[PDB]
Write an enzyme that holds these catalytic residues in place. Sequence first.
Site, PDB file in Angstrom:
ATOM      1  N   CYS A 181      16.631 -32.586  -7.675  1.00 33.44           N
ATOM      2  CA  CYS A 181      16.732 -33.267  -8.952  1.00 33.44           C
ATOM      3  C   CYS A 181      17.746 -32.492  -9.753  1.00 33.44           C
ATOM      4  O   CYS A 181      17.551 -31.318 -10.024  1.00 33.44           O
ATOM      5  CB  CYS A 181      15.380 -33.312  -9.677  1.00 33.44           C
ATOM      6  SG  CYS A 181      15.516 -34.066 -11.317  1.00 33.44           S
TER       7      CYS A 181
ATOM      8  N   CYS B  37      22.200 -38.552 -14.530  1.00 32.88           N
ATOM      9  CA  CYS B  37      21.619 -38.294 -13.195  1.00 32.88           C
ATOM     10  C   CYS B  37      22.552 -37.433 -12.401  1.00 32.88           C
ATOM     11  O   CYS B  37      23.642 -37.873 -12.047  1.00 32.88           O
ATOM     12  CB  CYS B  37      21.309 -39.563 -12.415  1.00 32.88           C
ATOM     13  SG  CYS B  37      20.491 -39.222 -10.838  1.00 32.88           S
TER      14      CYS B  37
END
Lengths: 376, 352
Positions: A110, A280
Site C-alpha cells: 500500500c 494511490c
Amino acid sequence: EKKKNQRANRREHQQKREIMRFKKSFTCIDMHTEGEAARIVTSGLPHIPGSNMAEKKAYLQENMDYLRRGIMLEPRGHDDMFGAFLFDPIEEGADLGIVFMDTGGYLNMCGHNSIAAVTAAVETGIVSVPAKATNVPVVLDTPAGLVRGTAHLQSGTESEVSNASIINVPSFLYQQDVVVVLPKPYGEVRVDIAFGGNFFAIVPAEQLGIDISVQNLSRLQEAGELLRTEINRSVKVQHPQLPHINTVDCVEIYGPPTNPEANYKNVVIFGNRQADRSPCGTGTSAKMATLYAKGQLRIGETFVYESILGSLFQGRVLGEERIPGVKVPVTKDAEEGMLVVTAEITGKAFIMGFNTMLFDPTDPFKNGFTLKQYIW
Amino acid sequence: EIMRFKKSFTCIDMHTEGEAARIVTSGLPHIPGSNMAEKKAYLQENMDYLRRGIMLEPRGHDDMFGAFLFDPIEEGADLGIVFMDTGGYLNMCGHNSIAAVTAAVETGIVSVPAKATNVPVVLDTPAGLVRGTAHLQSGTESEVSNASIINVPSFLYQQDVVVVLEVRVDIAFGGNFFAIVPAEQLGIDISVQNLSRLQEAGELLRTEINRSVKVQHPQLPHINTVDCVEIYGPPTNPEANYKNVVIFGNRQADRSPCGTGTSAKMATLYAKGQLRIGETFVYESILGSLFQGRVLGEERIPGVKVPVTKDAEEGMLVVTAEITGKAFIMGFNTMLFDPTDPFKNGFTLKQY
C-alpha cells in the site's frame, strides 16, 4: 469538606487505574496521506511467527483476522479505514517490518500507507535521525518485498518531515488492450493491466462515459466494481514470480487534470465499491510502468497524478530491467525476458492522532462490524 | 514539540451498542454562554469548523457522533455536555448520554462513594437536565454494567400528518423532534440491505416536513424544527417489541436503537393507550442491539397545548421516560490538527 474531596479524588484515582486492568490495548499513530487514512499500530500486538513478512501476513490472515477487524471496522474504525502493523525487520537492509490492511483484508503493499509509515517513523522517533541529516532513509520489509523510503526533513528541524518518498517494488505492464463488454450504460471498454505492488486495470474515464468528480463517485464506484468483476472471471492475471499474488485488485479510472501541475486525475476503485481519496501510490507506479512501456514517459521525468479531492503525488521512473526467462502477456520474447521498472512516488502524510485502542472482553463489538453489503 | 500539540483535543472514544460517541474532554477554550444552549449556539455560529474537523474524515467518518464536555452550570448537575454529529448539533442524544454517564464513572470524572452499586451522574444539556445512573458491576470499584438516563419530558405532538413523497407520520418530542413512520408505508422493510434507501427517504421526509409543518416546543422556544426521522417495523429478536432505524444529521443512520427516539416512541405509545406506566419496552436496532425503556410518570400541563391536545384548559400530556443501555470505552485519543493540513477541518464525499 477537605477530607471528603481528598477521599473523593483517591476513589477517582482508583477508578482510573481499574480501567486498563484485564483489558487489551494497542497504541496507534493515526495518519492520513492527502485525505486517505492510515492507522499505524505501534505496540500491543500479539507475537506472530514467520521467517519473512509474507509468512507473517499469512499467519495474520489465517489465524488473527480478528486483530484487523477490530482495528479497521466500526466502531473503532470505519468502512474506508486503512492500516498497518509494524514488526521487527527481517530482510537484511530493512528498518521496519510492515503488514498492511483495509476493511476487506490484509494486503501485500500500500503506497499511501507506506508514505505515512516513513513519515510517522521519523516524526515519532521510531527510527533515529543522525545529526545534521536532511534526508532519512526508512527501509520497509513488506510482504511484497523491500520498499526503500526516504523522509525529506523540513529545514531547521531535527524530525519534522516535509514529505516522503518510496521506491516501490518492481512494477510492470502485464497485458494491453483488453476488451471487456460491460452492461449498459457502460458498454465495451479497452483497458491495460499493470502491476505496481497490487494488480490494476487502468481505464480512461472517457470510455465509461463519466467525468471524474465527487458527484459522480457512486457511478464510478459501480463501473469500477463491474469492470473488476468481469476481468477476474474472463482474464488470467497472475504474478509470474510471486505466485501468491494473482488477481485484479483495483480499477484505476483516469481523465484530464483539473490542477495545472498534474498530468492526469484518477480515482482508484477497490475492495467493496470503495474509492481511494489519495492518488494511490501503487496505482501511480502501475500507470508510470504502463506509460513507460509505451514510450510515453522517460526515465527521470516527473509524473504528477491528481486524486478526486485534488491532492497530488509526484513520481519518477528511476530505472528498468528485463527479467530473462520470465514472461507476461505483453512480453514478446521470453528469452529476452519481461520488462520491469523501478518507480519512486512522493507525497505528504500528516499526523492526525495518537490513539490508545481498548478492547473490553465483554464488548460484543470488540471485533467490529460493517453495514456495507456485498451486492451480488 | 509544544506547538505540535497546540489546538489538539483529548477524547474518550466510546460506543453505545455499536454507535460511536467521541467525547471531547479537553482542548476547547472558554465558550461564552450562561447555559448549555448558549454554548451550543456559540459553537454553531463561530466554531463549526471544530465539529467538522472532529466528526468528518479523515479523523472521523460519515456516521460519527460526539460531544464536548463542559463544567456544569445548572444547579444539581455533574457535567455539562453539547452534542454534535456530521450535520450539526442535537439538543439531546440518548446513546451519547449513556456513553457520557458510563465514561464519567469509569474514568473518574465522578466519584463512586464506598460500597455503592449505583452512581448518579446528572448531565446539563441544551434540552435540560438529564438524570443518569451508572449501574456498577458487583465486586468492581468502577466497571459499569449498564447505564440509565431519565430523559427530558417527552410527548406526542401531532398525529396523522400527511406528507407527499404520500405517507402518514406522527410527530413526537423525545429531546429532539421526531417524525415517526412505520417502514411498510415506505414500501421498504428494515434490513442492512435497505439502509441506503432509508437514509434517502428519511432525508426527504425531514426536509419536506420542515417546509410544510410548523413544529415548536412549548417550553423551550429555540427547539423549533424536526431533526430526526424514526422508521420502525417488526422485531427480529424475541426480546424486542419493535425494530427501528433513525435518520438524522447529514443523512446518517443510528446504529443504536436511539435513546431520544425510544423516548418519543414510548410517549406515542403511552398517549395511545398501548403502553402502561412502569412497563418495560424494548427497542431493537438495525444491528440487533437493544435498549430498554420505561415510562416513569405522566403529567398534563394546564393551559399549554400542542396539535394533539384536545382541550387546552386540561393541557398537553407529557411523560418522563427512562432509557437503559450499555456503553464501552474503545480508546483514548489525542487528536492533532497540523495548521498546514488541507484537511484540518475534514471533508465528506457524501453526495448532496
